[PDB]
Amino acid sequence: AGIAASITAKGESKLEVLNFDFQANAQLSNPKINPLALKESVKFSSKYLRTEHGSEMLFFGNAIEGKSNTVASLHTEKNTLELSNGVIVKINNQLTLDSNTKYFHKLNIPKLDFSSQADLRNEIKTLLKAGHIAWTSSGKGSWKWACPRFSDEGTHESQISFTIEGPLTSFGLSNKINSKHLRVNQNLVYESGSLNFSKLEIQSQVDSQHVGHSVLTAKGMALFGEGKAEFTGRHDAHLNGKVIGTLKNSLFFSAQPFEITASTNNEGNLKVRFPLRLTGKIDFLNNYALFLSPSAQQASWQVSARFNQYKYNQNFSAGNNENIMEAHVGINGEANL
Amino acid sequence: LLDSPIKVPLLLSEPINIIDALEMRDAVEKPQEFTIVAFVKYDKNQDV
Asked: From what superkingdom does this record's organism come (chain B)?
């Protein structure tokens, strides 16, 4: 059993943009033993726009193969836009798909000397299987444009790594971007094996000429069953420009059976350049230390906050012990008038 | 009144009028021409 459906529609006038040239075809085949084949191709041609598509589906029982492409391209004096997609899908025992997507444009407006361009490839490769997932994609793209109000150039590179196998989850993210004014690398790593552990690691590195530099690094290792938590939190921030100074944050601790200690350390020496050449002298010491045990505990918090000519130290320290009980409050602050 | 442009709007704005592209000087008394011809057939084999 087969059906042939063909269409030829042609509406013609002047102003060629107004003239289209349409063609659509459809063909089907179906024997009694049920291997099915289907195919489609649709075409329209008008000077303003032209998009083309072709899809051919096949079904040999357990085996199914799907192919379908669509590409559109806009063409005008100022700009020519180009988008293309090709899709290959096949299902025999697993479900694996690839869908590629190329984007492009080249826009130029010489009225104000404007030119923009961007090519983007957005492709997916994915595999599905009972007991396994293999997913990954690459967000690859670049850009450039020069306009009196706006000018930029750089390349973007994003890769997404995900996978499943057994009771362990694997996921890897790594973003690397470059630009004339902004440079940054962002790697992220996570892994956790069933109910056994958890591995978390962060890698952020931001580059900025106007602000200076900033470094954030931190790593996590949590083991389950024994209730151990040990994450390392550190960060260094160099500030340049209107705000100049250094901010350092050391975050340490260790949660253990019957033992818990927390070490938080936030430090900052900031001199903010206000309008009219006025500088705010921000210098503060925020330091924390905790320990916990079933029989004894202690908590200490110390703040030494100083603004310009006003300095304030706030001291608090509590310690629980059978031998002695600690209870003291130290409050001190000066405000020049 | 019956000489107005007829079109399908892929682009709604016309840089040049369709009549202008036609270069006519249409007047009221000019008989505009329209003719629609359509055929449809469904075929059954007489060989039964």
From this structure: Eukaryota
Nearest C-alpha neighbor of A137 from the set A172, A185, A170, A112:
A172
Please enumerate in sequence order all residues whose Cβ is within 8 A of that of A332, keeping only pairs 6 or more positions apart, or say none.
A312, A313, A314, A315
Place of tokens 């299987």: A129
CA count, 13 A, side-chain hemisphere, A142: 5
Separation between Cα atoms, residue A158 and residue A162, nearest integer Å: 13
- Considering only CB atoms, which residues of chain A are within 8 Å of chain B? 11, 13-15, 17-18, 20, 46, 48-49
Closest alpha carbon within chain B to A10: B8
Residues of A in contact with B23 (CB under 8 A): none
- Half-sphere exposure of A244 toward its Cβ, with a 13 Å CA cutoff? 7
Mutating which of A10, A12, A13, A14 best tests the B interface, going by the most B Cβ atoms within 10 A? A14
CA count, 13 A, side-chain hemisphere, A202: 13
CA A177 to CA A170: how far, in whole Å? 23
- Check chain B for breaks (C–N over 2.5 Å) and list the residue before each, or none: none
With 0-12 / 13-18 / 19 or more C-beta atoms within 10 angstroms meaning exposed / middle / buried, residue A295 is: exposed
Selected for mutation to probe chain A from B7, B10, B16, B18 (highest A CB count within 10 Å) is B10
Nearest to A202 by CA among A215, A185, A187: A187
The rounded Cα B45 to chain-centroid distance in angstroms is 36
User: Could you give the CA distance from residue A215 to residue A38 in angstroms, rounded to a whole number?
Assistant: 57
Residues of chain B contacting residue A11, judged by C-beta atoms under 8 Å apart: 8
Query: Per the CB < 8 Å rule, is A18 touching B8?
Result: yes
B15 touches A at CB < 8 Å:
yes
Residue the block writes with tokens 């199914």:
A64
Nearest to B7 among A13, A48, A49 (CB): A13
CA nearest A125: which of A162, A98, A93? A98
Q: Does B18 touch chain A (CB under 8 A)?
A: yes
